[PDB]
Amino acid sequence: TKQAHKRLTKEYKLMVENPPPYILARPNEDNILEWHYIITGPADTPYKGGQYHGTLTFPSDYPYKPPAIRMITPNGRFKPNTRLKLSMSDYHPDTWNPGWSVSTILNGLLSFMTSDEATTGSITTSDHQKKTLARNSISYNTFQNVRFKLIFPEVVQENVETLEKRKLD
Amino acid sequence: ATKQAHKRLTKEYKLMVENPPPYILARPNEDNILEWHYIITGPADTPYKGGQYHGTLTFPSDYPYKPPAIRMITPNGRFKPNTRLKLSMSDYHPDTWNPGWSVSTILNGLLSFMTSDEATTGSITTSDHQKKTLARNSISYNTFQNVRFKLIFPEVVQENVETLEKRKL
Amino acid sequence: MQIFVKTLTGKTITLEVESSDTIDNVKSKIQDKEGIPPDQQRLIFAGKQLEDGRTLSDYNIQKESTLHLVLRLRGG
Amino acid sequence: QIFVKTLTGKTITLEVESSDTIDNVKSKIQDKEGIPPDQQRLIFAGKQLEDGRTLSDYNIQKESTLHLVLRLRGG
């Protein structure tokens, strides 16, 4: 659709100019409504050093409804490939501000992932499992994530170089 | 699933393996003879050209005396997903039903009504850009966002991954 | 020439038609071959409904092409 | 006088006191921006803040920069 294409094209430029900290995102070149994000685990969180691939599927009525949020890389916090039930705290739960940027949505997602709140899609693991999946996340996206190789071919090239350096030390 | 329904649907399945109707591939659930799954390939000279549309025919336990419930799962722009579609040969018309009608005729009625523009219960109003957009995204939807498609058509999921990889080359 | 028509019960019949024959003429020939309610059904080719006034040549229906009968309930 | 980076990326200044509650801080943010406090979440050096507390509970020195991230709730 024309309205969402122009808005999401603007969102991408704003994100290219100033990406949100720890978050990279770009739209699928064959579908502007489907964005693919990569979350880098913050230092204080057990997800440190993790490469976390997920999708942001914007509805056809964009920008009037929220997107569907999923996570693909095994991480220990969310069930992979499961739509996350995230709503906006309000008197009416079905409230969506049409003016929230994509960077605002992703920053809120990371802030939720760093917390311990539960929702539809939240899984309960330990901290040793979140650290283990954080270490193997780069390997997963490079070899076991078909959508990662299609959307992020250059990041796959950064991953293979990274893993070779991980053999050192 | 009665003995009479099981014999009929097995014969109807056998007839559709030998002579499948154009653009329509269908087979039942191995664990439920009554739950059939179809794949409509979008015909040419229609905005659905090249689309991969997955749906279901839920036959009642007392088949062949009551009509099945027709649905479509893949976002298509013609029908509301996961909603019972009111078609001539469907559970919306029980009194008109004839047990002698073949399963291929039921699917051809769904396909022909899909490529037309007559309104019915379950149909939606979209533009041509929206129909063609969903036709392009249909393969990616059934491959990664359709669990039932992955369980019923695992080999088509593999063909779809091959199709998408080559398109990204 | 000859064409084929799959009836509602899955049966296949053979019709002797000409490219000039209208879809309505074809439906009438079906009724001659076997008692048919023409107003009650429609013919399909290439996954799309065929209109009565148009010809097989207009629809590019060549020889040995198979047409399919689907039910046409008008009372929604 | 403290600063908080809004969702738009801009930085706004707030007339506050260490005695004032986090909720009142968000009310001033709503007066400035329009985002209601229910839809607000504030971070400071890598940790969030609770509405029932005040500014002194997090020992926030005057003229500090805070990051406003959009809250997101789920059940």
Residue numbers in the entry:
A (entry chain B): 3 to 171
B (entry chain A): 2 to 170
C (entry chain C): 1 to 76
D (entry chain D000): 2 to 76
Paper text:
Ubiquitin-conjugating enzymes (E2) play a crucial role in the attachment of ubiquitin to proteins. A subfamily of E2s, including yeast Ubc6 and human Ube2J2, also mediates noncanonical modification of serines, but the structural determinants for this chemical versatility remain unknown. A rearrangement of the Ubc6/Ube2J2 active site enhances the reactivity of the E2-Ub thioester, facilitating attack by weaker nucleophiles. Moreover, a conserved histidine in Ubc6/Ube2J2 activates a substrate serine by general base catalysis.
We also determined the structure of a ubiquitin-conjugated form of Ubc6 to 2.6 Å resolution. To stabilize the linkage between ubiquitin and the UBC, we mutated the active site cysteine (Cys87) to Lys, resulting in an isopeptide bond in place of of the native thioester. The asymmetric unit contains two copies of Ubc6-Ub, both adopting so-called “closed” conformations. These conformations are characterized by contacts between a hydrophobic patch centered on Ile44 in ubiquitin and the crossover helix α2 in the UBC domain. The Ubc6 active site is virtually unchanged in one copy of the heterodimer when compared to the ubiquitin-free form. However, in the second copy, there is a drastic conformational change for residues Lys87 to Trp98. The backbone of the C-terminal ubiquitin tail is traceable in the electron density map, but most side chains in this region are not well resolved. The conserved Ser89 forms hydrogen bonds with the backbone amide of Leu73Ub and the carbonyl oxygen of Leu71Ub. Analysis of [15N,1H]-HSQC spectra of Ubc6 coupled via a disulfide bond to 15N-labeled ubiquitin G76C showed chemical shift perturbations (CSPs) typical of closed ubiquitin conformations, confirming that such conformations of Ubc6 are also prominently present in solution. Our X-ray structure of Ubc6-Ub, the structure of Ube2J2, and our MD simulations suggest conformational flexibility in the active site loop, leading to the displacement of the catalytically important histidine residue away from the active site cysteine.
